[PDB]
Amino acid sequence: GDDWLKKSTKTAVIQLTRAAQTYTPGMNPRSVNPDGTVRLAPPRDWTTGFFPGTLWYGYELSGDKNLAAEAKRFTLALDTIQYVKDTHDLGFMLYCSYGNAYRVTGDKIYLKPLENGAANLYARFNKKVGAIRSWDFGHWQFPVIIDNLMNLEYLYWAGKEFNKPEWFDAAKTHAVTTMKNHFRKDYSSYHVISYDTLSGKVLQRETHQGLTNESAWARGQAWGLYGYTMSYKDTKDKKFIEHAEHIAAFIMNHPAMPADKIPLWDFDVHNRDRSPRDASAAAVIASALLDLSTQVKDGQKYFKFAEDILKTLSSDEYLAKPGENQFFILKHSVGALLYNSEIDTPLNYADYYYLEALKRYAEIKKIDLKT
């Protein structure tokens, strides 16, 4: 039956309603600190766009006009991000917020900030490397992280919306370059590839938030799966769907994939029974597998795996009770374990991708979740 989905949606709507009443636009809820207080994400924070995005998704699921009003308020507080030049994360920041806003409402107030942001994101693409530079800090000449695949969605959309084929082509080139260099022979991914800015040659292959340079950081594996599923959706290049299916098999068949399908924070840890799980990785995987299931020849195995993840995420173990968890929807994500950062806490992006997955699932099943 579908009762789990209906009650989870009801709970999500309550949580979002209370969150939007409690937090202040421009200081978005991010995670819960060890002392129980809430870590907030100002406009410079890479996660700042997720909460308004989650509000848009809550509105789409429920039809609740209050959630649309709150989504507008929390979105427009992020106006300054259209001037940010130093990061690939403009997709997570602006496209999850303003991008969803414009898709849902068609209101032109959202459009110019999107156009300005897209030009700034494209400016980070280096033609000689064939990729967007992820960040500007630290010792790397030209670091590109697996997470940067997610930020391509913004450019595919903007290239079409604004008649800027080089923006679209740059995103596609980034996906092709990453497909070659970020993946090991078993279809696991590295976190960071560092390039030579002039020659485009690979200089280093290393982790940032995983266990080791050689390891399979779970959220990174999820960003890869999603990145190629979405790149297929937006470009229709069969190389991307083939790559997505190879990644999906690596993930789904992995010896360290737990019975309940919520990944360990890194697939290569030795302590499988007691290793912290990462709900955010599970949510990203579920959302991606649902889209993959509609794109491929026989998608049932992908749909079923995503459904099983969603049932686990929607259980008492993962889904906050109404009014609890500082109004976050899910529990048990891991931000950066080796940094002692955000270990076993709700995270705003876990909630965003979880509601995205619920919306995709409900669309496939034709389930009405309107209040």
mmCIF file of C-alpha atoms in Angstrom:
data_model
loop_
_atom_site.group_PDB
_atom_site.id
_atom_site.type_symbol
_atom_site.label_atom_id
_atom_site.label_comp_id
_atom_site.label_asym_id
_atom_site.label_seq_id
_atom_site.Cartn_x
_atom_site.Cartn_y
_atom_site.Cartn_z
ATOM 1 C CA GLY A 1 0.000 0.000 0.000
ATOM 2 C CA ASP A 2 0.843 3.687 -0.338
ATOM 3 C CA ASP A 3 0.066 4.792 3.233
ATOM 4 C CA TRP A 4 3.760 5.261 4.079
ATOM 5 C CA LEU A 5 4.018 7.833 1.275
ATOM 6 C CA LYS A 6 0.883 9.729 2.298
ATOM 7 C CA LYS A 7 1.832 9.961 5.966
ATOM 8 C CA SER A 8 5.414 10.919 5.142
ATOM 9 C CA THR A 9 4.174 13.702 2.875
ATOM 10 C CA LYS A 10 1.809 14.976 5.608
ATOM 11 C CA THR A 11 4.685 15.020 8.063
ATOM 12 C CA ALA A 12 6.961 16.801 5.595
ATOM 13 C CA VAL A 13 4.361 19.521 5.043
ATOM 14 C CA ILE A 14 4.054 20.091 8.805
ATOM 15 C CA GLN A 15 7.833 20.222 9.240
ATOM 16 C CA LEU A 16 8.251 22.716 6.392
ATOM 17 C CA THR A 17 5.373 24.837 7.684
ATOM 18 C CA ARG A 18 6.996 25.098 11.108
ATOM 19 C CA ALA A 19 10.499 25.609 9.651
ATOM 20 C CA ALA A 20 9.361 28.517 7.461
ATOM 21 C CA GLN A 21 7.615 30.109 10.500
ATOM 22 C CA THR A 22 10.732 29.702 12.636
ATOM 23 C CA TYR A 23 13.800 30.457 10.466
ATOM 24 C CA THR A 24 14.560 33.791 8.803
ATOM 25 C CA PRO A 25 14.932 34.200 5.020
ATOM 26 C CA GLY A 26 18.620 34.556 4.171
ATOM 27 C CA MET A 27 19.698 32.401 7.134
ATOM 28 C CA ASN A 28 18.555 28.970 6.055
ATOM 29 C CA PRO A 29 18.496 25.893 8.283
ATOM 30 C CA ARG A 30 21.421 23.600 7.447
ATOM 31 C CA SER A 31 22.049 20.977 10.140
ATOM 32 C CA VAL A 32 21.835 20.324 13.877
ATOM 33 C CA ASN A 33 24.956 20.883 15.998
ATOM 34 C CA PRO A 34 26.110 18.358 18.647
ATOM 35 C CA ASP A 35 24.641 20.687 21.315
ATOM 36 C CA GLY A 36 21.203 20.605 19.667
ATOM 37 C CA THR A 37 21.280 24.128 18.198
ATOM 38 C CA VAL A 38 20.734 24.761 14.486
ATOM 39 C CA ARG A 39 23.588 25.562 12.103
ATOM 40 C CA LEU A 40 22.398 28.225 9.666
ATOM 41 C CA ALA A 41 23.408 28.784 6.024
ATOM 42 C CA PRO A 42 23.775 32.453 4.984
ATOM 43 C CA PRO A 43 23.846 33.308 1.244
ATOM 44 C CA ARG A 44 27.560 32.459 0.891
ATOM 45 C CA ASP A 45 27.005 28.905 2.199
ATOM 46 C CA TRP A 46 26.915 26.202 -0.487
ATOM 47 C CA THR A 47 23.818 24.608 1.052
ATOM 48 C CA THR A 48 21.820 27.827 1.327
ATOM 49 C CA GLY A 49 19.557 27.142 -1.680
ATOM 50 C CA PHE A 50 18.293 23.751 -0.487
ATOM 51 C CA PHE A 51 15.696 24.906 2.083
ATOM 52 C CA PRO A 52 13.812 27.212 -0.332
ATOM 53 C CA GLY A 53 14.008 24.390 -2.896
ATOM 54 C CA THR A 54 12.492 21.986 -0.370
ATOM 55 C CA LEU A 55 9.674 24.475 0.207
ATOM 56 C CA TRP A 56 8.969 24.510 -3.557
ATOM 57 C CA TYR A 57 8.859 20.720 -3.546
ATOM 58 C CA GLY A 58 6.578 20.696 -0.474
ATOM 59 C CA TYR A 59 4.260 23.043 -2.378
ATOM 60 C CA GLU A 60 4.279 20.791 -5.451
ATOM 61 C CA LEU A 61 3.483 17.681 -3.402
ATOM 62 C CA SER A 62 0.738 19.233 -1.308
ATOM 63 C CA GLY A 63 -0.732 22.177 -3.217
ATOM 64 C CA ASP A 64 -0.436 24.134 0.012
ATOM 65 C CA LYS A 65 -0.444 27.796 -1.007
ATOM 66 C CA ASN A 66 1.258 28.779 2.228
ATOM 67 C CA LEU A 67 4.305 26.719 1.232
ATOM 68 C CA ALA A 68 4.452 28.552 -2.122
ATOM 69 C CA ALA A 69 4.365 31.894 -0.290
ATOM 70 C CA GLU A 70 7.125 30.756 2.069
ATOM 71 C CA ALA A 71 9.164 29.389 -0.832
ATOM 72 C CA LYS A 72 8.988 32.826 -2.503
ATOM 73 C CA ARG A 73 10.157 34.611 0.700
ATOM 74 C CA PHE A 74 13.069 32.229 1.316
ATOM 75 C CA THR A 75 14.051 32.265 -2.386
ATOM 76 C CA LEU A 76 14.150 36.041 -2.871
ATOM 77 C CA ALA A 77 16.412 36.451 0.168
ATOM 78 C CA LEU A 78 19.146 34.779 -1.941
ATOM 79 C CA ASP A 79 19.309 37.549 -4.584
ATOM 80 C CA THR A 80 22.979 38.338 -3.830
ATOM 81 C CA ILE A 81 24.108 34.910 -5.040
ATOM 82 C CA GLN A 82 23.706 36.114 -8.639
ATOM 83 C CA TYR A 83 26.956 38.079 -8.155
ATOM 84 C CA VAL A 84 29.039 35.190 -6.763
ATOM 85 C CA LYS A 85 31.992 34.163 -8.960
ATOM 86 C CA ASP A 86 34.195 31.904 -6.828
ATOM 87 C CA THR A 87 32.370 28.568 -6.885
ATOM 88 C CA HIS A 88 30.761 25.857 -8.999
ATOM 89 C CA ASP A 89 27.994 25.588 -6.366
ATOM 90 C CA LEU A 90 25.738 28.157 -8.082
ATOM 91 C CA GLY A 91 23.628 25.215 -9.265
ATOM 92 C CA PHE A 92 22.898 23.999 -5.725
ATOM 93 C CA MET A 93 22.526 27.597 -4.499
ATOM 94 C CA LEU A 94 20.536 29.370 -7.252
ATOM 95 C CA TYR A 95 19.174 26.593 -9.416
ATOM 96 C CA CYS A 96 17.639 24.693 -6.446
ATOM 97 C CA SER A 97 16.028 27.907 -5.222
ATOM 98 C CA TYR A 98 15.370 30.387 -8.046
ATOM 99 C CA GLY A 99 15.422 27.580 -10.631
ATOM 100 C CA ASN A 100 12.599 25.694 -8.967
ATOM 101 C CA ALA A 101 10.798 28.981 -8.300
ATOM 102 C CA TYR A 102 10.838 29.927 -11.989
ATOM 103 C CA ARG A 103 9.821 26.432 -13.109
ATOM 104 C CA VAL A 104 6.890 26.310 -10.690
ATOM 105 C CA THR A 105 5.579 29.882 -11.087
ATOM 106 C CA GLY A 106 6.904 31.259 -14.395
ATOM 107 C CA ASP A 107 7.288 34.592 -12.561
ATOM 108 C CA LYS A 108 9.830 36.864 -14.226
ATOM 109 C CA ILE A 109 11.111 38.128 -10.863
ATOM 110 C CA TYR A 110 13.188 34.922 -10.756
ATOM 111 C CA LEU A 111 14.679 35.163 -14.231
ATOM 112 C CA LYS A 112 17.412 37.817 -14.205
ATOM 113 C CA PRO A 113 19.180 36.374 -11.128
ATOM 114 C CA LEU A 114 19.165 33.005 -12.918
ATOM 115 C CA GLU A 115 20.671 34.531 -16.045
ATOM 116 C CA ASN A 116 23.383 36.365 -14.103
ATOM 117 C CA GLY A 117 24.224 33.230 -12.079
ATOM 118 C CA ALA A 118 24.516 31.108 -15.183
ATOM 119 C CA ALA A 119 27.014 33.470 -16.794
ATOM 120 C CA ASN A 120 29.116 33.306 -13.618
ATOM 121 C CA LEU A 121 28.992 29.524 -13.560
ATOM 122 C CA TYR A 122 29.962 29.281 -17.222
ATOM 123 C CA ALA A 123 32.876 31.693 -16.599
ATOM 124 C CA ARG A 124 34.425 28.948 -14.437
ATOM 125 C CA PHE A 125 34.584 26.486 -17.358
ATOM 126 C CA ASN A 126 38.089 26.196 -18.764
ATOM 127 C CA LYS A 127 38.158 25.273 -22.435
ATOM 128 C CA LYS A 128 41.650 23.721 -22.256
ATOM 129 C CA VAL A 129 40.740 21.439 -19.345
ATOM 130 C CA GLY A 130 37.231 20.699 -20.602
ATOM 131 C CA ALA A 131 35.707 21.259 -17.121
ATOM 132 C CA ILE A 132 34.374 23.799 -14.642
ATOM 133 C CA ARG A 133 36.852 24.628 -11.879
ATOM 134 C CA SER A 134 35.054 23.643 -8.663
ATOM 135 C CA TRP A 135 36.827 26.024 -6.301
ATOM 136 C CA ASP A 136 39.565 28.590 -6.013
ATOM 137 C CA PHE A 137 41.021 27.922 -2.568
ATOM 138 C CA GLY A 138 43.825 25.607 -1.541
ATOM 139 C CA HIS A 139 46.896 24.283 -3.313
ATOM 140 C CA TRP A 140 45.321 22.657 -6.394
ATOM 141 C CA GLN A 141 45.990 24.191 -9.760
ATOM 142 C CA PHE A 142 42.526 23.226 -10.980
ATOM 143 C CA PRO A 143 40.413 21.027 -8.730
ATOM 144 C CA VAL A 144 37.217 19.402 -10.020
ATOM 145 C CA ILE A 145 35.007 17.495 -7.593
ATOM 146 C CA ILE A 146 32.444 14.811 -8.420
ATOM 147 C CA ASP A 147 29.722 17.030 -6.828
ATOM 148 C CA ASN A 148 30.274 19.496 -9.734
ATOM 149 C CA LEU A 149 28.189 17.133 -11.945
ATOM 150 C CA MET A 150 25.097 18.314 -10.049
ATOM 151 C CA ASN A 151 25.827 21.943 -10.908
ATOM 152 C CA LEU A 152 25.670 21.118 -14.643
ATOM 153 C CA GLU A 153 21.857 20.948 -14.528
ATOM 154 C CA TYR A 154 21.749 24.739 -14.127
ATOM 155 C CA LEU A 155 23.857 25.238 -17.277
ATOM 156 C CA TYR A 156 21.938 22.746 -19.428
ATOM 157 C CA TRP A 157 18.752 24.612 -18.523
ATOM 158 C CA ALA A 158 20.262 28.092 -18.924
ATOM 159 C CA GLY A 159 21.945 27.304 -22.248
ATOM 160 C CA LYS A 160 18.523 26.496 -23.676
ATOM 161 C CA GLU A 161 16.537 29.233 -21.873
ATOM 162 C CA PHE A 162 18.916 32.046 -22.887
ATOM 163 C CA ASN A 163 19.986 30.766 -26.308
ATOM 164 C CA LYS A 164 23.584 30.249 -25.189
ATOM 165 C CA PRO A 165 24.731 27.025 -26.877
ATOM 166 C CA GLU A 166 28.260 27.422 -25.449
ATOM 167 C CA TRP A 167 26.801 27.220 -21.930
ATOM 168 C CA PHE A 168 24.983 23.995 -22.776
ATOM 169 C CA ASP A 169 28.028 22.598 -24.604
ATOM 170 C CA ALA A 170 30.301 23.479 -21.681
ATOM 171 C CA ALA A 171 28.121 21.501 -19.278
ATOM 172 C CA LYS A 172 28.108 18.537 -21.655
ATOM 173 C CA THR A 173 31.902 18.743 -22.078
ATOM 174 C CA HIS A 174 32.344 18.780 -18.286
ATOM 175 C CA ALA A 175 30.253 15.592 -18.041
ATOM 176 C CA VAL A 176 32.339 13.898 -20.761
ATOM 177 C CA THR A 177 35.679 14.916 -19.202
ATOM 178 C CA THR A 178 34.472 13.747 -15.760
ATOM 179 C CA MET A 179 33.209 10.499 -17.221
ATOM 180 C CA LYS A 180 36.754 9.692 -18.324
ATOM 181 C CA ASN A 181 38.806 10.989 -15.398
ATOM 182 C CA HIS A 182 36.713 10.714 -12.234
ATOM 183 C CA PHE A 183 35.944 6.979 -12.607
ATOM 184 C CA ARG A 184 37.937 3.901 -11.723
ATOM 185 C CA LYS A 185 37.658 0.679 -13.747
ATOM 186 C CA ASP A 186 34.979 -0.659 -11.386
ATOM 187 C CA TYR A 187 32.859 2.502 -11.958
ATOM 188 C CA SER A 188 33.523 3.826 -8.471
ATOM 189 C CA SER A 189 34.418 7.496 -8.468
ATOM 190 C CA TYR A 190 37.212 9.603 -6.975
ATOM 191 C CA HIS A 191 36.227 12.749 -5.133
ATOM 192 C CA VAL A 192 38.755 15.232 -6.605
ATOM 193 C CA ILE A 193 40.601 15.260 -9.885
ATOM 194 C CA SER A 194 43.216 17.997 -10.189
ATOM 195 C CA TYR A 195 44.128 19.161 -13.683
ATOM 196 C CA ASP A 196 46.877 21.120 -15.390
ATOM 197 C CA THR A 197 45.211 24.367 -16.458
ATOM 198 C CA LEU A 198 47.199 24.651 -19.681
ATOM 199 C CA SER A 199 47.531 21.051 -20.895
ATOM 200 C CA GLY A 200 44.336 19.645 -19.378
ATOM 201 C CA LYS A 201 46.284 16.626 -18.163
ATOM 202 C CA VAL A 202 45.288 14.906 -14.932
ATOM 203 C CA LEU A 203 47.793 15.724 -12.185
ATOM 204 C CA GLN A 204 46.219 14.119 -9.096
ATOM 205 C CA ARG A 205 43.339 11.800 -8.169
ATOM 206 C CA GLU A 206 42.361 12.084 -4.527
ATOM 207 C CA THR A 207 39.646 12.195 -1.905
ATOM 208 C CA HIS A 208 38.329 15.165 -0.002
ATOM 209 C CA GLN A 209 35.371 13.859 2.031
ATOM 210 C CA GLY A 210 35.835 10.092 1.696
ATOM 211 C CA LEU A 211 37.879 7.574 3.619
ATOM 212 C CA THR A 212 40.950 7.495 1.314
ATOM 213 C CA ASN A 213 42.088 8.511 -2.159
ATOM 214 C CA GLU A 214 41.088 5.018 -3.335
ATOM 215 C CA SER A 215 37.710 4.894 -1.632
ATOM 216 C CA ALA A 216 34.060 5.199 -2.667
ATOM 217 C CA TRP A 217 32.668 8.116 -0.676
ATOM 218 C CA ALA A 218 28.926 7.326 -0.665
ATOM 219 C CA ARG A 219 27.466 10.766 -1.382
ATOM 220 C CA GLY A 220 30.065 11.138 -4.137
ATOM 221 C CA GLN A 221 28.939 7.884 -5.731
ATOM 222 C CA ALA A 222 25.370 9.248 -5.513
ATOM 223 C CA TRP A 223 26.316 12.582 -7.166
ATOM 224 C CA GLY A 224 27.880 10.560 -10.018
ATOM 225 C CA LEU A 225 24.789 8.406 -10.517
ATOM 226 C CA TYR A 226 22.513 11.440 -10.418
ATOM 227 C CA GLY A 227 24.883 13.535 -12.575
ATOM 228 C CA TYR A 228 24.728 11.023 -15.468
ATOM 229 C CA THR A 229 21.006 10.303 -15.117
ATOM 230 C CA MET A 230 20.320 14.059 -15.270
ATOM 231 C CA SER A 231 22.888 14.625 -18.072
ATOM 232 C CA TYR A 232 21.092 11.948 -20.103
ATOM 233 C CA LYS A 233 17.725 13.595 -19.413
ATOM 234 C CA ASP A 234 19.020 16.986 -20.539
ATOM 235 C CA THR A 235 21.213 15.983 -23.541
ATOM 236 C CA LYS A 236 19.864 12.589 -24.662
ATOM 237 C CA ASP A 237 23.428 11.383 -25.244
ATOM 238 C CA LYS A 238 23.295 7.604 -24.810
ATOM 239 C CA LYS A 239 26.861 7.518 -23.438
ATOM 240 C CA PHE A 240 25.511 9.143 -20.272
ATOM 241 C CA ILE A 241 22.685 6.637 -19.702
ATOM 242 C CA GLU A 242 25.082 3.741 -20.301
ATOM 243 C CA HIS A 243 27.429 5.248 -17.724
ATOM 244 C CA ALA A 244 24.534 5.777 -15.310
ATOM 245 C CA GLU A 245 23.580 2.108 -15.559
ATOM 246 C CA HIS A 246 27.177 1.014 -14.866
ATOM 247 C CA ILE A 247 27.275 3.258 -11.798
ATOM 248 C CA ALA A 248 23.860 1.987 -10.679
ATOM 249 C CA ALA A 249 25.082 -1.620 -10.805
ATOM 250 C CA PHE A 250 28.243 -0.782 -8.844
ATOM 251 C CA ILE A 251 26.059 0.835 -6.141
ATOM 252 C CA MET A 252 23.142 -1.611 -6.070
ATOM 253 C CA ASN A 253 25.260 -4.767 -6.125
ATOM 254 C CA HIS A 254 27.947 -3.497 -3.802
ATOM 255 C CA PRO A 255 28.997 -5.999 -1.094
ATOM 256 C CA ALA A 256 28.847 -3.131 1.427
ATOM 257 C CA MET A 257 25.352 -1.941 0.460
ATOM 258 C CA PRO A 258 23.383 -2.557 3.681
ATOM 259 C CA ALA A 259 20.208 -4.631 3.791
ATOM 260 C CA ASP A 260 18.041 -1.526 4.327
ATOM 261 C CA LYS A 261 19.731 0.271 1.371
ATOM 262 C CA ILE A 262 20.936 3.336 3.280
ATOM 263 C CA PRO A 263 24.625 3.479 2.378
ATOM 264 C CA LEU A 264 27.514 3.556 4.803
ATOM 265 C CA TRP A 265 29.086 6.999 4.642
ATOM 266 C CA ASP A 266 31.915 5.447 2.580
ATOM 267 C CA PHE A 267 31.483 2.068 0.876
ATOM 268 C CA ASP A 268 35.040 0.968 1.749
ATOM 269 C CA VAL A 269 35.014 1.199 5.535
ATOM 270 C CA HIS A 270 36.005 -1.960 7.349
ATOM 271 C CA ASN A 271 33.304 -1.718 10.076
ATOM 272 C CA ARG A 272 30.133 -2.337 8.072
ATOM 273 C CA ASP A 273 27.875 -3.184 10.992
ATOM 274 C CA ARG A 274 28.592 -0.043 13.020
ATOM 275 C CA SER A 275 29.686 2.536 10.433
ATOM 276 C CA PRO A 276 27.499 5.698 10.356
ATOM 277 C CA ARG A 277 24.935 5.698 7.520
ATOM 278 C CA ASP A 278 24.408 8.654 5.226
ATOM 279 C CA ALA A 279 20.746 9.315 4.525
ATOM 280 C CA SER A 280 21.633 12.158 2.098
ATOM 281 C CA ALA A 281 23.421 9.681 -0.192
ATOM 282 C CA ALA A 282 20.380 7.351 -0.016
ATOM 283 C CA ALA A 283 18.007 10.194 -0.958
ATOM 284 C CA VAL A 284 20.148 11.274 -3.950
ATOM 285 C CA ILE A 285 20.387 7.659 -5.101
ATOM 286 C CA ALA A 286 16.624 7.123 -4.768
ATOM 287 C CA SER A 287 15.821 10.285 -6.755
ATOM 288 C CA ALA A 288 18.301 9.349 -9.485
ATOM 289 C CA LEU A 289 17.136 5.724 -9.723
ATOM 290 C CA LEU A 290 13.535 6.860 -10.148
ATOM 291 C CA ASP A 291 14.487 9.007 -13.150
ATOM 292 C CA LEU A 292 16.763 6.233 -14.452
ATOM 293 C CA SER A 293 13.853 3.782 -14.236
ATOM 294 C CA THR A 294 11.870 5.920 -16.732
ATOM 295 C CA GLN A 295 14.763 6.368 -19.183
ATOM 296 C CA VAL A 296 16.021 2.811 -19.661
ATOM 297 C CA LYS A 297 14.706 -0.247 -21.501
ATOM 298 C CA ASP A 298 13.767 -2.229 -18.388
ATOM 299 C CA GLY A 299 13.689 0.014 -15.382
ATOM 300 C CA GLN A 300 11.838 -2.077 -12.786
ATOM 301 C CA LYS A 301 14.988 -3.057 -10.838
ATOM 302 C CA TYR A 302 15.856 0.639 -10.458
ATOM 303 C CA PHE A 303 12.328 1.614 -9.465
ATOM 304 C CA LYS A 304 12.140 -1.206 -6.883
ATOM 305 C CA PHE A 305 15.503 -0.303 -5.354
ATOM 306 C CA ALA A 306 14.471 3.364 -5.059
ATOM 307 C CA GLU A 307 11.111 2.371 -3.571
ATOM 308 C CA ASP A 308 12.886 0.247 -0.936
ATOM 309 C CA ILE A 309 15.180 3.165 -0.041
ATOM 310 C CA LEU A 310 12.183 5.467 0.277
ATOM 311 C CA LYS A 311 10.357 3.041 2.544
ATOM 312 C CA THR A 312 13.415 2.973 4.847
ATOM 313 C CA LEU A 313 13.848 6.757 4.762
ATOM 314 C CA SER A 314 10.133 7.142 5.565
ATOM 315 C CA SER A 315 10.269 4.810 8.588
ATOM 316 C CA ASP A 316 10.527 5.955 12.219
ATOM 317 C CA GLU A 317 14.281 5.384 12.133
ATOM 318 C CA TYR A 318 14.833 8.082 9.453
ATOM 319 C CA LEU A 319 11.746 10.291 9.291
ATOM 320 C CA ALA A 320 11.384 12.905 12.040
ATOM 321 C CA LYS A 321 8.141 13.078 13.992
ATOM 322 C CA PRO A 322 6.112 16.263 13.464
ATOM 323 C CA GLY A 323 7.555 19.094 15.492
ATOM 324 C CA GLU A 324 10.851 17.340 16.255
ATOM 325 C CA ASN A 325 14.358 17.326 14.763
ATOM 326 C CA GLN A 326 14.458 21.154 14.573
ATOM 327 C CA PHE A 327 11.829 20.801 11.808
ATOM 328 C CA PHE A 328 14.138 18.932 9.449
ATOM 329 C CA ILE A 329 12.426 16.068 7.639
ATOM 330 C CA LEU A 330 15.080 13.275 7.723
ATOM 331 C CA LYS A 331 17.685 12.173 10.260
ATOM 332 C CA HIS A 332 21.107 10.480 9.979
ATOM 333 C CA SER A 333 23.208 12.205 7.304
ATOM 334 C CA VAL A 334 26.996 12.579 7.434
ATOM 335 C CA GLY A 335 28.599 15.790 6.169
ATOM 336 C CA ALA A 336 32.344 15.118 6.491
ATOM 337 C CA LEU A 337 33.231 12.350 8.918
ATOM 338 C CA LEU A 338 37.023 12.666 8.814
ATOM 339 C CA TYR A 339 36.629 16.383 9.662
ATOM 340 C CA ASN A 340 34.373 15.570 12.639
ATOM 341 C CA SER A 341 31.756 17.645 10.834
ATOM 342 C CA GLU A 342 28.007 17.056 10.736
ATOM 343 C CA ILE A 343 28.171 13.408 11.732
ATOM 344 C CA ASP A 344 24.729 11.801 12.140
ATOM 345 C CA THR A 345 22.581 14.938 11.780
ATOM 346 C CA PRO A 346 19.780 16.104 9.550
ATOM 347 C CA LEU A 347 21.026 18.056 6.533
ATOM 348 C CA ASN A 348 19.015 20.402 4.373
ATOM 349 C CA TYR A 349 20.040 18.679 1.125
ATOM 350 C CA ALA A 350 18.950 15.253 2.401
ATOM 351 C CA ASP A 351 15.476 16.746 2.792
ATOM 352 C CA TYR A 352 15.572 18.378 -0.661
ATOM 353 C CA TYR A 353 16.496 15.183 -2.521
ATOM 354 C CA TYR A 354 14.107 13.134 -0.398
ATOM 355 C CA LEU A 355 11.132 15.296 -1.361
ATOM 356 C CA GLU A 356 12.355 15.292 -4.982
ATOM 357 C CA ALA A 357 12.312 11.491 -4.840
ATOM 358 C CA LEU A 358 8.807 11.452 -3.315
ATOM 359 C CA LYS A 359 7.573 13.709 -6.127
ATOM 360 C CA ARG A 360 9.193 11.465 -8.787
ATOM 361 C CA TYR A 361 7.810 8.332 -7.154
ATOM 362 C CA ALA A 362 4.299 9.774 -6.881
ATOM 363 C CA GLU A 363 4.410 10.866 -10.537
ATOM 364 C CA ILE A 364 5.355 7.376 -11.699
ATOM 365 C CA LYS A 365 2.663 5.744 -9.559
ATOM 366 C CA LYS A 366 0.103 8.511 -10.293
ATOM 367 C CA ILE A 367 -0.524 9.085 -6.601
ATOM 368 C CA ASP A 368 -2.320 12.285 -5.592
ATOM 369 C CA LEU A 369 -0.714 13.773 -2.469
ATOM 370 C CA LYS A 370 -2.555 17.139 -2.424
ATOM 371 C CA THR A 371 -3.711 18.285 1.040
#
